Ligand binder design. Structure first.
Ligand SMILES: Nc1nc2c(ncn2[C@@H]2O[C@@H]3COP(=O)(O)O[C@H]4[C@@H](O)[C@H](n5cnc6c(=O)[nH]c(N)nc65)O[C@@H]4COP(=O)(O)O[C@H]3[C@H]2O)c(=O)[nH]1
Ligand SMILES: Nc1nc2c(ncn2[C@@H]2O[C@@H]3COP(=O)(O)O[C@H]4[C@@H](O)[C@H](n5cnc6c(=O)[nH]c(N)nc65)O[C@@H]4COP(=O)(O)O[C@H]3[C@H]2O)c(=O)[nH]1
Ligand SMILES: Nc1nc2c(ncn2[C@@H]2O[C@@H]3COP(=O)(O)O[C@H]4[C@@H](O)[C@H](n5cnc6c(=O)[nH]c(N)nc65)O[C@@H]4COP(=O)(O)O[C@H]3[C@H]2O)c(=O)[nH]1
Ligand SMILES: Nc1nc2c(ncn2[C@@H]2O[C@@H]3COP(=O)(O)O[C@H]4[C@@H](O)[C@H](n5cnc6c(=O)[nH]c(N)nc65)O[C@@H]4COP(=O)(O)O[C@H]3[C@H]2O)c(=O)[nH]1
Ligand SMILES: [Mg+2]
Lengths: 198, 196
């Protein structure tokens, strides 16, 4: 039955290839990140652009947190990818729990990067949530040997807010500001909240 | 040997199984309706639930259109399901022309129903948009023998708007009120907008 077998291998190869293509297509149509269950980056961009227009309409404050996991590459190295993945789920959970309003959105922005969209939220309120999230990540007390061998996982967080309508500003500049602030946080020793320059 | 073909086949069975699972998992998460490209009902429910809470917070006016395709069961029976599906495709096209704000959302609510959520929108504005959808559908001139030979496909539309109150009031009251307006439109002759 060696024709029988070789034939089945061929049948299955074809069926599998179809399924792999189907998976690829569906992934581009789904809003969530497989690992963490948060919004994926595509949906983040889409959602934030839409909120940009709502805030423009209402002249409301649109806030954004850009959140990065500190020393994460070394975590994967010294604890393994599987553990890393679980650390990411735990951080995501903290981020998710960090925003409670129906209009808040938590997203996985990249490999180890997250974002929170906060419609109708003042710079002050955004700052609070940023601290709340960072603090919640710490209280998770996930073990890391970096930089000190007795340390726990942390995030750095950049904060920005804008009322849309100002010349030359877009949801993309809102991101750029939060990224700027994120840099500050990291370069001031990480595990902290950096604020945009008014 | 016959043993290398047997292992490879088992491997492929396993890969196949997991792939099929992943495809089914992802299909449940898709937010769009295949036929019309609008939001599906599950996404509509989620979106309306979130908008209700946003409107509660801002004490803003939240409007809803519930849209029935008139005599649609008869249409599908008379002209067949393929034709019916094409009619639904064209009506959806007419609808999504109907809203433009980043917060407006149109959906396939059910087999022959559509809905449109209009956050921050006054009753007057909602009626305006509803009339536009109604007019656009009729201009499609899709042939129908209902209510009589030589008619065309139309919609009846119910409009509601509420500023959410607290307590146990949920977004479902907005749907109930739009359905009541829709009933008025239908009982008044169809191919029109009912209101309240
Ligand atoms: N987007 C977003 N922002 C958040 C969230 N949590 C808090 N904030 C921000 O943090 C600021 C201060 O929050 P608070 O200390 O709880 O102080 C709050 C709280 O005591 C009360 N409050 C606001 N809304 C609610 C609510 O929905 N439920 C409850 N229990 N209290 C609320 O009013 C005070 C002032 O509220 P705000 O002026 O709006 O200002 C809030 C808001 O800008 C959140 O989950 N999502
Ligand atoms: N401590 C604190 N908690 C917050 C804040 N923002 C949101 N939350 C939490 O997130 C839940 C959902 O908020 P929502 O979707 O905006 O939905 C809210 C909002 O639509 C409205 N709401 C409640 N309190 C306030 C308020 O103080 N001001 C305004 N404008 N709306 C409120 O009622 C809905 C349900 O309220 P909750 O049962 O309290 O449930 C709130 C509350 O548990 C905040 O700033 N501070
Ligand atoms: N408060 C307020 N905000 C305004 C006004 N004009 C424009 N905007 C703001 O500017 C954005 C783009 O406006 P647009 O280019 O006219 O592009 C608009 C326009 O083409 C159309 N649109 C939405 N609502 C209306 C309306 O009420 N009347 C008309 N003629 N067009 C509208 O849909 C597009 C997207 O709307 P949005 O996503 O909401 O995004 C709108 C909204 O954030 C205004 O008179 N009042
Ligand atoms: N949800 C939703 N509602 C819509 C849309 N288009 C029109 N409306 C509704 O229809 C009402 C009258 O629209 P208008 O004659 O264009 O009269 C508008 C228009 O002249 C201007 N406007 C508002 N927003 C926009 C906008 O985004 N773009 C432009 N170009 N004009 C706008 O402000 C006037 C009054 O606006 P409203 O008080 O909001 O009242 C609006 C709003 O309730 C839409 O695409 N989505
Ligand atoms: Mg119905």
């Amino acid at each position: 039955r060696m024709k029988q077998l070789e034939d089945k291998v061929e049948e299955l190869l074809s069926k599998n290839y179809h399924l792999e293509n189907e998976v690829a297509r569906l992934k581009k149509l789904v809003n969530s990140d497989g690992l963490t269950g948060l919004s994926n980056r595509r949906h983040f961009d889409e959602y934030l652009e839409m909120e940009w227009r709502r805030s423009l309409r209402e002249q409301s404050q649109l806030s954004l947190l850009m959140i990065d996991v500190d020393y994460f590459k070394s975590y994967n190295d010294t604890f393994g990818h599987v553990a890393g993945d679980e650390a990411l789920r735990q951080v995501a959970g903290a981020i998710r729990e960090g925003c409670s309003r129906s209009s808040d959105l938590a997203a996985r922005y990249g490999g180890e990067e997250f974002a929170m969209v906060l419609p109708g939220t003042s710079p002050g309120g955004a700052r609070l949530l940023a601290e709340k999230v960072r603090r919640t990540v710490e209280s998770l007390q996930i073990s890391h040997d970096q930089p000190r061998p007795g340390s726990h996982l942390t995030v750095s967080i950049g904060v920005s807010t804008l009322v849309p309508g100002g010349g030359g500003q877009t949801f993309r500049v809102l991101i750029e500001m939060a990224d700027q602030a994120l840099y500050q946080a990291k370069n001031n020793g990480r595990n902290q909240v950096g604020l945009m320059e008014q």
